[PDB]
Amino acid sequence: LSKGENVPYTFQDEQVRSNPYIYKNHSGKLVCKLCNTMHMSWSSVERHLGGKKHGLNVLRRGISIEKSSXXXXXXXXXXXXXXXXXXXXXXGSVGLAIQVNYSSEVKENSVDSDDKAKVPPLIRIVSGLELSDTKQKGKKFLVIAYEPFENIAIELPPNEILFSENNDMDNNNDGVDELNKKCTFWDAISKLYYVQ
RNA sequence: AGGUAUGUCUAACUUCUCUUAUUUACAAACAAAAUCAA
Numbered sequence: 001l002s003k004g005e006n007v008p009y010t011f012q013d014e015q016v017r018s019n020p021y022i023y024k025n026h027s028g029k030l031v032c033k034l035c036n037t038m039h040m041s042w043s044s045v046e047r048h049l050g051g052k053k054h055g056l057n058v059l060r061r062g063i064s065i066e067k068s069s070x071x072x073x074x075x076x077x078x079x080x081x082x083x084x085x086x087x088x089x090x091x092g093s094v095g096l097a098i099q100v101n102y103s104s105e106v107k108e109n110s111v112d113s114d115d116k117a118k119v120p121p122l123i124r125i126v127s128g129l130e131l132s133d134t135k136q137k138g139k140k141f142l143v144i145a146y147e148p149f150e151n152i153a154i155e156l157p158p159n160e161i162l163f164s165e166n167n168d169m170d171n172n173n174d175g176v177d178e179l180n181k182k183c184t185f186w187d188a189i190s191k192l193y194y195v196q
Numbered sequence: 197a198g199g200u201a202u203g204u205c206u207a208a209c210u211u212c213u214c215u216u217a218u219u220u221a222c223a224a225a226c227a228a229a230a231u232c233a234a
């Protein structure tokens with residue numbers, strides 16, 4: 001569960017840490033220096049991190065820094081769709097555009113009970129800091145998801161591309177987020193999802 | 197030769213409740229079984 005990381009003792013006088021918080025004191029137990037909470041096992045440590053308590057102390061420490069100045073029934077065939085990445089350009093910079101194609105009424109003929117069928121594909125930017133394997137990380141992914149088909153990701157080394165500035169005139173139908181409404185199109189008649 | 201006089205030149209701002217559950221460690225040289233004319 002430790003994912004092979006080495007947490008140095010508090011007295012070893014600090015290699016960069018994943019979270020520079022959880023330590024081991026003079027004794028063998030694990031502690032959160034901010035929260036000042038002792039934890040028996042790494043599982044308890046992860047409960048602490050996933051707990052609201054630790055988070056509140058993180059926000060308090062950030063304030064100190066500024067001062068110092070449906071999920072169940074989800075069908076899953078895990079089928080990799082076909083993406084068509086292509087370097088785009090407009091004006092005045094460079095942006096990316098993806099063309100994802102979906103089934104041709106091949107298997108979607110057995111499921112038509114208006115169960116989120118009206119819901120279009122959704123995209124989100126995920127940090128690689130969390131993976132099923134947790135080995136390497138440090139870059140973002142433009143994940144795209146649809147109920148039956150399997151998720152898809154696209155690595156984005158560049159810190160920022162096509163991140164525009166008030167493209168439209170501030171109209172508020174949040175849909176899912178500014179990203180989706182701002183720059184996505186869902187040709188539902190042909191089943192083609194464009195993203196740029 | 198000496199002395200005097202005159203002139204000219206040259207130098208010098210401090211003292212992290214409750215609740216009900218789950219997770220995980222730990223303590224007590226804690227106790228370990230059988231036999232019974234016990």
Ligand SMILES: [Zn+2]
Nearest residue numbers: 032034035054
């Ligand atoms: Zn903490």
